[PDB]
Enzyme design. Structure first.
Site, short mmCIF file in Angstrom:
data_model
loop_
_atom_site.label_atom_id
_atom_site.label_comp_id
_atom_site.label_asym_id
_atom_site.label_seq_id
_atom_site.Cartn_x
_atom_site.Cartn_y
_atom_site.Cartn_z
N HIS A 36 38.08 36.87 53.24
CA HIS A 36 38.28 35.44 53.01
C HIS A 36 39.40 35.19 52.00
O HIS A 36 40.21 34.27 52.19
CB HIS A 36 36.98 34.78 52.54
N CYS A 39 43.72 40.49 51.57
CA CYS A 39 44.12 41.31 52.70
C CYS A 39 44.76 42.58 52.17
O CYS A 39 45.38 42.56 51.10
CB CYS A 39 45.10 40.55 53.62
SG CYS A 39 45.58 41.45 55.10
N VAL A 40 44.64 43.67 52.92
CA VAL A 40 45.22 44.94 52.48
C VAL A 40 46.07 45.49 53.61
O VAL A 40 45.62 45.56 54.75
CB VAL A 40 44.15 45.97 52.09
CG1 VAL A 40 44.82 47.18 51.44
CG2 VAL A 40 43.13 45.34 51.14
N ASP A 152 29.19 46.43 40.68
CA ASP A 152 29.00 46.53 42.14
C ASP A 152 29.20 47.97 42.61
O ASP A 152 29.90 48.23 43.59
CB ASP A 152 29.92 45.58 42.91
CG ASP A 152 29.50 45.38 44.36
OD1 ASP A 152 28.38 45.79 44.77
OD2 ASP A 152 30.31 44.81 45.12
N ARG A 156 30.11 51.70 49.60
CA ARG A 156 31.14 50.89 50.26
C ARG A 156 32.33 50.60 49.35
O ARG A 156 33.39 50.20 49.85
CB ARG A 156 30.54 49.57 50.75
CG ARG A 156 29.92 48.74 49.63
CD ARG A 156 29.46 47.34 50.05
NE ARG A 156 28.81 46.74 48.88
CZ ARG A 156 27.53 46.91 48.56
NH1 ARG A 156 26.73 47.61 49.36
NH2 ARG A 156 27.04 46.37 47.44
N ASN A 157 32.17 50.74 48.04
CA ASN A 157 33.25 50.38 47.13
C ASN A 157 34.00 51.58 46.58
O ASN A 157 35.05 51.39 45.94
CB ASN A 157 32.71 49.53 45.97
CG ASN A 157 32.48 48.07 46.40
OD1 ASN A 157 33.13 47.56 47.32
ND2 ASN A 157 31.52 47.40 45.76
N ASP A 170 36.42 49.35 43.20
CA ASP A 170 35.74 48.13 43.57
C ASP A 170 36.47 47.56 44.78
O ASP A 170 37.12 46.52 44.69
CB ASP A 170 35.68 47.16 42.39
CG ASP A 170 34.65 46.04 42.58
OD1 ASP A 170 34.04 45.96 43.66
OD2 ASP A 170 34.47 45.25 41.64
O1 LIG Z 1 39.27 48.85 42.74
C1 LIG Z 1 39.51 47.89 42.02
N1 LIG Z 1 39.11 47.83 40.74
C2 LIG Z 1 38.41 48.90 40.13
C3 LIG Z 1 38.92 50.19 40.21
C4 LIG Z 1 38.22 51.25 39.66
C5 LIG Z 1 37.01 50.99 39.07
F1 LIG Z 1 36.33 52.03 38.53
C6 LIG Z 1 36.47 49.74 38.98
C7 LIG Z 1 37.18 48.68 39.52
C8 LIG Z 1 40.28 46.71 42.55
C9 LIG Z 1 40.79 46.74 43.96
O2 LIG Z 1 41.44 45.81 44.41
N2 LIG Z 1 40.47 47.85 44.64
C10 LIG Z 1 40.88 48.22 45.95
C11 LIG Z 1 40.31 49.37 46.49
C12 LIG Z 1 40.67 49.82 47.74
C13 LIG Z 1 41.61 49.11 48.47
O3 LIG Z 1 42.00 49.55 49.74
C14 LIG Z 1 42.50 50.80 49.91
C15 LIG Z 1 43.16 51.45 48.88
C16 LIG Z 1 43.61 52.71 49.17
N3 LIG Z 1 43.46 53.30 50.36
C17 LIG Z 1 42.77 52.59 51.28
N4 LIG Z 1 42.58 53.19 52.49
C18 LIG Z 1 41.69 52.89 53.55
C19 LIG Z 1 41.78 53.64 54.71
C20 LIG Z 1 40.93 53.37 55.77
C21 LIG Z 1 39.99 52.37 55.68
C22 LIG Z 1 39.89 51.63 54.53
C23 LIG Z 1 40.74 51.88 53.46
N5 LIG Z 1 42.30 51.35 51.09
C24 LIG Z 1 42.18 47.98 47.92
F2 LIG Z 1 43.12 47.32 48.64
C25 LIG Z 1 41.84 47.53 46.68
C26 LIG Z 1 39.88 45.32 42.04
C27 LIG Z 1 41.16 45.92 41.58
#
Ligand SMILES: O=C(Nc1ccc(F)cc1)C1(C(=O)Nc2ccc(Oc3ccnc(Nc4ccccc4)n3)c(F)c2)CC1
Length: 285
Positions: A36, A39-40, A152, A156-157, A170
């Site tokens: 919502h 986007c990544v 959280d 999944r995270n 996260d």
């Molecule tokens: O993680 C965060 N904060 C934090 C970090 C450490 C912690 F201990 C506590 C909190 C934040 C964040 O935005 N995280 C995020 C995490 C993954 C993401 O997607 C990613 C990234 C890298 N590779 C892939 N690959 C992939 C491949 C196939 C299928 C699916 C995914 N997706 C993304 F876009 C953002 C809030 C800032």
């Protein structure tokens, strides 16, 4: 966006990790996920020697609300000093003259840990799954030492890289997609006291970690599948998640400690790393 309207300390922190727009190619056709608010995309980051770095590039869908923009940038800055092999790191933040700022993350080949363990084409052993749990505990031990509360923690995270190293993160993709596990809060991962007060601590992260261990030992089963996101009444009847068939007895005992009714009596992540290291070491493979 108008940088002048943001908190100046936030902008200063962003500038210390800034990526120049010409150094980042966003592959807008290659979407990793969309919700919502965010986007990544896949992206290519060029370093100073021209080496290409595969990254994930996170964007907002709208940039009209100063609160949302500030919060999005703040999420990136919160992780800028995370430096640990089991915690996701930040490559930088790309400010553009038009459009959303971009949060740039190292690409994680195997996506999130929950979908990885659910994928029947992968065959992690019990020892491998305990190892994933140990890696999460190590990342959480690091985060707790920084007085960072996750709020959280769930399979999944967390992410998994190409060497099958777990990176606590996260991700929030299920959250941003309004996945059923969030009710109005990830209630099936929450400590009893947080269900009652909506306050979170490192000791309520420990409760969530116990649920994450249960996720690992069931290869990604949904917790309490026949309970609706009623969970507080259910727990207070005197209940916990059942022991998974292939969960070793000492690891289930660890889970029950993580779900102690008194937060003060739950083991620290330092204790959890030690205990799980020992359990892990008893497996040949
Ligand atoms: O993680 C965060 N904060 C934090 C970090 C450490 C912690 F201990 C506590 C909190 C934040 C964040 O935005 N995280 C995020 C995490 C993954 C993401 O997607 C990613 C990234 C890298 N590779 C892939 N690959 C992939 C491949 C196939 C299928 C699916 C995914 N997706 C993304 F876009 C953002 C809030 C800032």
């Amino acid at each position: 966006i108008d940088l002048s309207a943001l908190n100046p300390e936030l902008v200063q922190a962003v500038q210390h990790v800034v990526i120049g727009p010409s150094s980042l190619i966003v592959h807008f056709n290659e979407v990793i996920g969309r919700g919502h608010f965010g986007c990544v995309y896949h992206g290519t980051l060029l370093d100073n020697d021209g080496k290409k770095i595969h990254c994930a590039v996170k964007s907002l869908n709208r940039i009209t609300d100063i609160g949302e923009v500030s919060q999005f940038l703040t999420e990136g800055i919160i992780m800028k000093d995370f430096s640990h092999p089991n915690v996701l790191s930040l490559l930088g933040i790309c400010l553009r003259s038009e459009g959303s700022p971009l949060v740039v993350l190292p690409y994680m080949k195997h996506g999130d840990l929950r979908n990885f363990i659910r994928n029947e084409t992968h065959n992690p052993t019990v020892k491998d799954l305990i190892g994933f749990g140990l890696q999460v505990a190590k990342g959480m031990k690091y985060l707790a030492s920084k007085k960072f509360v996750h709020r959280d923690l769930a399979a999944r995270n967390c992410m998994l890289d190409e060497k099958f190293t777990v990176k606590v993160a996260d991700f929030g993709l299920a959250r941003d997609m309004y996945d059923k596990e969030y009710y109005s809060l990830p209630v099936k991962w929450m400590a009893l006291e947080s269900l009652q007060t909506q306050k979170f601590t490192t000791k309520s992260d420990v409760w969530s970690f116990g649920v994450l261990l249960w996720e690992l030992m069931t290869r990604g089963a949904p917790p309490y599948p026949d309970v609706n996101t009623d969970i507080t009444v259910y727990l207070l009847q005197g209940r916990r998640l059942l022991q998974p068939e292939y969960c070793p007895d000492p690891l289930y005992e660890v889970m029950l400690k993580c779900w102690h009714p008194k937060a003060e009596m739950r083991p620290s992540f330092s204790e959890l790393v030690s205990r799980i290291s020992a359990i892990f070491s008893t497996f040949i493979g």
